[PDB]
Amino acid sequence: AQYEDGKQYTTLEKPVAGAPQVLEFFSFFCPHCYQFEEVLHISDNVKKKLPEGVKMTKYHVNFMGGDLGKDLTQAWAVAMALGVEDKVTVPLFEGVQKTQTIRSASDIRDVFINAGIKGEEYDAAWNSFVVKSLVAQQEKAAADVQLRGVPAMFVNGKYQLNPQGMDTSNMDVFVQQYADTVKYLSEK
Numbered sequence: 001a002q003y004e005d006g007k008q009y010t011t012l013e014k015p016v017a018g019a020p021q022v023l024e025f026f027s028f029f030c031p032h033c034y035q036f037e038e039v040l041h042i043s044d045n046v047k048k049k050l051p052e053g054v055k056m057t058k059y060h061v062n063f064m065g066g067d068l069g070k071d072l073t074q075a076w077a078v079a080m081a082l083g084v085e086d087k088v089t090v091p092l093f094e095g096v097q098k099t100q101t102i103r104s105a106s107d108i109r110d111v112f113i114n115a116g117i118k119g120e121e122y123d124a125a126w127n128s129f130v131v132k133s134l135v136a137q138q139e140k141a142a143a144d145v146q147l148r149g150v151p152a153m154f155v156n157g158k159y160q161l162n163p164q165g166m167d168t169s170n171m172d173v174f175v176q177q178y179a180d181t182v183k184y185l186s187e188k
Contacts, residue, residue, distance in 0.1 A: 007165045008181045012158055016144045019157025020057040022046065022182065025142060025150050028072050028096045029065040033151045037093060040175050042151075049179045054186055058085075059138040061150055065096075071105045072096075077134035078112070078125045087115040155185040 005011050024043060026033040036042040047056055060076035062069050072092070079085045091111045095102035102108055112122045125131050145154060153161040166177045 003181065003184050007162065008177070009155075009162050009185060010160045012145065012154075012160060014146075016154075016157030019141070019144065019154065021054045021156060021186070022050065022056045023141060023154045023157070024056070024058040025061050025147055025152045026058065027061050027064040027069065027150050028092050028102075029069060030150045031097070034093050034097050036151050037089060040171060040178075042153075042175060042178060045175050045179045046153075046182045049183045050186060051183070057141075059141055061142055061147065062139065063148075064150070068096075068102070068104070068108075071108055073138055074126065074131065074135055075105075075108045075112075077131045077138065078122065080134055081125050081128070081131050082117060082121070084112070084115065084117055087117075088112055091115065153182065155182060156188075159185045159188070161185075 003009070026036070043056065043058060050056070060073040062073050065072065075088075075092070076085075079088050088111055091114065092102070092108070095107065095111055102111070109119075109122055109126075113119060144157070145152075145160075151163075155161075161178065161181060163174075163178060166174055166181075168174050
């Protein structure tokens, strides 16, 4: 067919029940993830082509970047709790990979301060049990799919996107094939 199991996507031998409809995993340390966010804007272009009533989840992972890696997963939980993802995603990517000015939890916090989250509000969330359960949700979702690499995207806990099977001569064409593939899998 035009979309083939094993080509633009793969099928989980062990499907995950009750998984989110579209579930993306990334790391602020991950070079292709930087590309997906800052150059390709994958999450956004997928959103623009997803149907009605299909919600999108994006989670951070621990397995890159050691101690700071875990700090960033917790920081992403803060971002989700406060709803400031769109304000901190770029400065966190650039802080880790471009300028390399993120070297500690305190430097992560600075990004949120600079984006206008109040210090007391950040520190309260950081230490909150609401954020602890969000960190657990992130870990469990990754565990559920045996996640070993990023970026990764799953549709309905059953299908994993396979971008290596797509043409990358043209960025925009690549993005639409990716988005269109997510839409296809979504309607499966």
